Tab-separated table of C-alpha atoms and ligand atoms in Angstrom:
chain	number	residue	atom	x	y	z
A	1	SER	CA	0.000	0.000	0.000
A	2	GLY	CA	0.966	3.671	-0.373
A	3	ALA	CA	0.063	6.929	-2.096
A	4	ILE	CA	1.606	10.283	-3.170
A	5	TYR	CA	-0.156	13.417	-1.853
A	6	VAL	CA	0.586	16.486	-4.024
A	7	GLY	CA	-1.604	19.635	-4.098
A	8	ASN	CA	-5.258	18.526	-4.153
A	9	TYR	CA	-4.310	15.137	-5.687
A	10	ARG	CA	-3.784	11.570	-4.354
A	11	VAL	CA	-1.783	9.205	-6.650
A	12	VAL	CA	-2.233	5.453	-6.031
A	13	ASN	CA	-1.724	2.141	-7.900
A	14	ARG	CA	-4.886	1.790	-10.036
A	15	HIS	CA	-5.309	-1.871	-8.897
A	16	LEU	CA	-5.397	-0.731	-5.220
A	17	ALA	CA	-7.732	2.310	-5.725
A	18	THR	CA	-10.627	2.431	-3.225
A	19	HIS	CA	-14.377	3.210	-3.796
A	20	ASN	CA	-13.589	6.784	-2.600
A	21	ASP	CA	-10.718	7.127	-5.133
A	22	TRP	CA	-13.091	6.165	-7.999
A	23	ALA	CA	-15.867	8.511	-6.682
A	24	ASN	CA	-13.339	11.436	-6.813
A	25	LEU	CA	-11.579	10.303	-10.055
A	26	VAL	CA	-9.380	12.861	-11.863
A	27	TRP	CA	-7.464	10.530	-14.234
A	28	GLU	CA	-6.647	6.811	-14.571
A	29	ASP	CA	-4.578	4.706	-16.963
A	30	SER	CA	-4.803	0.890	-16.830
A	31	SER	CA	-1.715	0.610	-19.081
A	32	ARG	CA	0.348	2.505	-16.414
A	33	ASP	CA	-1.320	0.973	-13.268
A	34	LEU	CA	-2.003	4.579	-12.084
A	35	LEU	CA	-5.062	6.393	-10.727
A	36	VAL	CA	-5.280	9.995	-9.430
A	37	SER	CA	-8.165	11.178	-7.236
A	38	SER	CA	-8.965	14.635	-5.770
A	39	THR	CA	-8.525	15.485	-2.053
A	40	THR	CA	-9.988	18.156	0.224
A	41	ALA	CA	-6.719	18.520	2.247
A	42	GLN	CA	-3.578	20.015	0.754
A	43	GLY	CA	-0.753	17.595	0.084
A	44	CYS	CA	2.836	18.773	-0.012
A	45	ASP	CA	4.801	15.756	-1.323
A	46	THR	CA	6.874	17.250	-4.208
A	47	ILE	CA	7.295	15.603	-7.618
A	48	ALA	CA	10.766	15.245	-9.190
A	49	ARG	CA	11.137	16.835	-12.689
A	50	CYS	CA	14.399	15.224	-13.846
A	51	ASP	CA	16.074	12.296	-15.642
A	52	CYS	CA	17.594	10.588	-12.543
A	53	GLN	CA	18.259	6.837	-12.823
A	54	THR	CA	19.301	6.358	-9.145
A	55	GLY	CA	17.183	6.851	-6.035
A	56	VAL	CA	15.864	5.206	-2.868
A	57	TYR	CA	12.599	3.256	-2.451
A	58	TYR	CA	10.576	2.164	0.566
A	59	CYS	CA	10.032	-1.636	0.850
A	60	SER	CA	7.192	-2.350	3.335
A	61	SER	CA	7.919	-6.129	3.373
A	62	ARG	CA	11.324	-5.353	4.926
A	63	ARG	CA	10.418	-2.040	6.797
A	64	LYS	CA	13.510	-0.604	5.029
A	65	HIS	CA	14.570	1.792	2.306
A	66	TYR	CA	16.979	0.518	-0.394
A	67	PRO	CA	19.117	2.452	-2.896
A	68	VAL	CA	18.536	1.444	-6.563
A	69	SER	CA	19.750	2.021	-10.101
A	70	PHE	CA	16.652	1.983	-12.394
A	71	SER	CA	15.942	1.888	-16.155
A	72	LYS	CA	14.270	4.761	-18.089
A	73	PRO	CA	10.437	4.576	-18.248
A	74	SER	CA	9.460	2.083	-20.949
A	75	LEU	CA	6.892	-0.495	-22.200
A	76	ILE	CA	7.567	-3.753	-20.310
A	77	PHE	CA	5.733	-7.071	-20.563
A	78	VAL	CA	3.973	-7.952	-17.270
A	79	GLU	CA	2.571	-11.429	-16.522
A	80	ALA	CA	-1.156	-11.891	-15.820
A	81	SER	CA	-2.327	-11.349	-12.223
A	82	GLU	CA	-5.781	-11.342	-10.528
A	83	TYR	CA	-5.875	-7.580	-11.410
A	84	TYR	CA	-4.856	-7.525	-15.101
A	85	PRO	CA	-4.428	-9.922	-18.059
A	86	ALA	CA	-0.864	-10.372	-19.488
A	87	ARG	CA	-0.017	-7.007	-21.151
A	88	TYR	CA	2.612	-4.313	-21.777
A	89	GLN	CA	2.677	-1.841	-18.916
A	90	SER	CA	3.930	1.564	-20.067
A	91	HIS	CA	6.074	4.177	-18.213
A	92	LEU	CA	7.582	1.352	-16.043
A	93	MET	CA	11.126	1.468	-14.618
A	94	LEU	CA	12.905	-1.684	-13.406
A	95	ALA	CA	15.625	-2.125	-10.816
A	96	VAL	CA	17.267	-5.017	-8.975
A	97	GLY	CA	15.653	-5.194	-5.524
A	98	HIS	CA	13.182	-6.984	-3.282
A	99	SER	CA	9.412	-6.670	-3.528
A	100	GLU	CA	6.238	-8.655	-2.639
A	101	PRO	CA	2.632	-7.750	-3.883
A	102	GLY	CA	1.850	-5.747	-0.726
A	103	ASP	CA	4.852	-3.518	-1.465
A	104	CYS	CA	2.950	-1.695	-4.281
A	105	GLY	CA	2.587	1.982	-3.454
A	106	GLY	CA	6.041	2.372	-1.815
A	107	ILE	CA	7.626	5.612	-2.975
A	108	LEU	CA	10.804	5.853	-5.072
A	109	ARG	CA	12.555	9.241	-4.505
A	110	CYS	CA	15.675	10.935	-5.825
A	111	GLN	CA	17.301	14.216	-4.549
A	112	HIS	CA	14.638	16.225	-6.544
A	113	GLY	CA	11.525	14.619	-5.118
A	114	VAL	CA	9.131	11.757	-5.757
A	115	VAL	CA	9.904	9.755	-8.918
A	116	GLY	CA	7.229	7.034	-8.815
A	117	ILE	CA	5.642	4.175	-6.856
A	118	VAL	CA	6.267	0.390	-6.691
A	119	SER	CA	3.947	-1.299	-9.203
A	120	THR	CA	5.479	-4.702	-10.170
A	121	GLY	CA	8.061	-7.237	-8.994
A	122	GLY	CA	9.404	-10.740	-8.899
A	123	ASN	CA	12.616	-12.760	-9.009
A	124	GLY	CA	14.709	-10.041	-7.431
A	125	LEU	CA	13.411	-7.253	-9.675
A	126	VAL	CA	11.172	-4.355	-8.657
A	127	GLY	CA	9.238	-2.128	-11.071
A	128	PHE	CA	8.153	1.494	-10.449
A	129	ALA	CA	5.355	3.408	-12.225
A	130	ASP	CA	6.944	6.774	-13.187
A	131	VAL	CA	4.987	9.984	-12.354
A	132	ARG	CA	7.616	12.622	-13.459
A	133	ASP	CA	5.933	13.200	-16.818
A	134	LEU	CA	2.560	14.163	-15.182
A	135	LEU	CA	3.227	17.911	-15.187
A	136	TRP	CA	-0.375	18.759	-14.276
A	137	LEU	CA	0.118	17.209	-10.773
A	138	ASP	CA	1.578	20.617	-9.683
A	139	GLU	CA	0.524	22.865	-12.646
B	201	LIG	N1	1.286	-3.578	-12.179
B	201	LIG	C1	0.799	-4.816	-12.179
B	201	LIG	O1	0.336	-5.355	-13.193
B	201	LIG	C2	0.907	-5.575	-10.867
B	201	LIG	C3	-0.477	-5.837	-10.248
B	201	LIG	C4	-0.349	-6.591	-8.910
B	201	LIG	C5	0.458	-7.868	-9.085
B	201	LIG	N2	1.755	-7.577	-9.722
B	201	LIG	C6	2.967	-7.841	-9.184
B	201	LIG	O2	4.002	-7.664	-9.806
B	201	LIG	C7	2.983	-8.348	-7.753
B	201	LIG	C8	4.374	-8.710	-7.287
B	201	LIG	C9	4.785	-10.038	-7.246
B	201	LIG	C10	6.021	-10.365	-6.712
B	201	LIG	C11	6.832	-9.341	-6.245
B	201	LIG	N3	6.482	-8.041	-6.272
B	201	LIG	C12	5.295	-7.767	-6.766
B	201	LIG	CL1	4.796	-6.101	-6.699
B	201	LIG	C13	1.643	-6.915	-11.024
B	202	LIG	ZN1	16.045	13.510	-9.744
């Protein structure tokens, strides 16, 4: 679990979005595993606007943060799960690191701010849904 709170927006993994997220829907993209909903309270997480390929992510299944080197956002094949059929997930960045399903939503950050959230994993790899291209999150 986990979300990014920026301005009047909440960014979560689309497969973990709640009834309240869908009732206050701003934007969603199944191909990216992202959903953004509106909030009444002001959020002040800050989004990175950069091309960093190193950062630190939070891994809830270890209660620890790990440093990672990660690939540029790209279209990556993701195996079928109970949430989606087998498909290409876009804007996904992979790194070598630990993750379990419950780790989705953990933030990846660089020195500039939030980069993305854990979205996929397996076999010692972890994948992060990038949010740096969503300029409207802080217009
Ligand atoms: N973005 C998706 O399609 C994910 C939906 C939930 C399921 N997905 C996973 O990858 C779950 C997983 C398995 C083993 C280690 N880490 C993780 Cl995060 C895929
Ligand atoms: Zn950066």
